[PDB]
Ligand binder design. Structure first.
Ligand SMILES: Nc1ncnc2c1ncn2[C@@H]1O[C@H](COP(=O)(O)O)[C@@H](O)[C@H]1O
Ligand SMILES: Nc1ncnc2c1ncn2[C@@H]1O[C@H](COP(=O)(O)O)[C@@H](O)[C@H]1O
Lengths: 185, 184, 185
């Protein structure tokens, strides 16, 4: 039988309340992949291309609970885990791959770091911009996008879908080389 | 099993030619971050659902490496981009062109002959004109001068971006963004 | 230049770091007897068809020197050896390791992140750890204690031998000759 070779994890929160918030951009990418998600453990899980795509149902800062058991079961190394998430440290229109390093305060990234015991999983950072002050971060990410931002969101979603498949096929450095410098604004 | 596009770099194979002007197209493909290996009469890399070619045919016979793949995969000419040195543009200029004449470029002519159409796209990378117009073959088979190397570096970084632009967005948006640049 | 391998010594540049525990990798590279010169953000030497590097990046940034070089020369990660001090082994231990976690070593993390893989080789030179982990930065940026220095000499000699071994035979054969040593005995 086959054995799953990679995890692609979309960050978000469960339920209709949160489906259109900036903090669900990772779920919005996973829903653009043409996949068949089904319930498994504490997530919605799709298989494609010999690995797993998941939208955890844990809430955003508890996704590590859903990712780490799957990684351990399948012996999937951090470089074959890609966490797709919104990023306040980049403007909307910018996308960046990153292997490891800081979480920049993103508590979903931190959840997965604690659960795995390593920071060195891969990330696809989807810029959403930042409020005028950092003390407004929770409110900013749990808001929807402004209507005027929607056309850019659509371009980013499309780019991100391409990026995900790039990474699955090629790993991080090649994909970073062609996607990091895009300005979708 | 389905390939959506071909990007073809012009050049001659071998270390002897790797730094020559007529290898500008190879040099751009070598900046894209891909993994090339031998495949037919070419070094080929796969990325983004298409193929990138550095032919092994020599410059003037590149069509022979392009056409089997275009035929097999049913790639229309508008999804083939030929990246090549252009003596009719100065060093520092880059221009997208859809279709049209080969303008004496024997590699471009080889591709037109092999595909049976001019409709394919080109990324023309200016290299300037030799002083003596009878020394054009020798000019393209020489290295860039020391003092041109900084401009070459800018044009390679730009052309790298331009190729990816074309892959994602097609030619009009990218001609919009690049054709006006002057990196000299 | 076709380059068959990269051997990287972890350290920081400058006199004030030269004798610190975190400079064991530089100390091994200086034991090789080679002629290093500046090249990019590194001191570089050539021998046996490959490259030997003391990056000038600082310890936690060495991936920025290593990864572009490896990509330029198409060097697979298993032909990259990183020589470094290791708090998770006692002084006197010398262990080759393929892949695995960085164990918190921020220089090994730099390389893993920049390469986008764990798959490079390491020559782990034990230095022990402080009794409280909250003074780890001071511990690594300290010289060895007086009584430690004779041990360090045995470890540097063995590590020079081990680098030459690995250049020729790579990791398993050389692990078979070095990994059971305890030079504190
Ligand atoms: N770089 C970031 N990208 C996305 N979400 C973030 C980032 N930094 C902070 N957050 C979220 O913003 C909220 C405010 O976090 P804090 O800044 O620690 O007050 C929390 O829900 C974080 O998970
Ligand atoms: N296993 C290790 N070997 C060597 N240096 C380490 C190791 N773990 C942590 N360090 C360094 O120790 C310092 C303290 O690390 P930490 O306690 O994580 O931030 C930093 O400079 C780390 O890079």
């Amino acid at each position: 039988g086959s054995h799953m070779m990679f995890l692609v994890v979309g960050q978000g929160n469960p339920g209709e309340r949160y489906a259109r918030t900036r903090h669900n951009l990772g779920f919005m990418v996973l829903d653009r992949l043409g996949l068949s998600f089904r319930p498994r453990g504490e997530a919605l899980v799709a298989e494609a291309e010999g690995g797993l795509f998941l939208k955890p149902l844990t809430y955003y800062n508890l996704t590590g609970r859903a990712v780490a058991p799957l990684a351990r079961f399948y012996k999937i190394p951090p470089e074959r885990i890609l966490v797709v998430h919104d990023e306040m440290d980049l403007p909307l229109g910018r996308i960046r791959f990153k292997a490891g390093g800081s979480a920049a305060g993103n508590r979903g990234v931190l959840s997965i770091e604690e659960a795995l015991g390593t920071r060195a999983f891969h990330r696809l950072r989807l810029g959403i911009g930042k409020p005028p002050d950092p003390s407004r971060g929770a409110e900013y990410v749990l808001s929807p996008f402004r209507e005027e931002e929607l056309p850019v969101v659509e371009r980013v979603l499309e780019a991100a879908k391409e990026a995900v498949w790039c990474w699955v096929r090629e790993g991080l450095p090649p994909c970073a080389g062609r996607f990091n410098g895009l300005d979708l604004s």
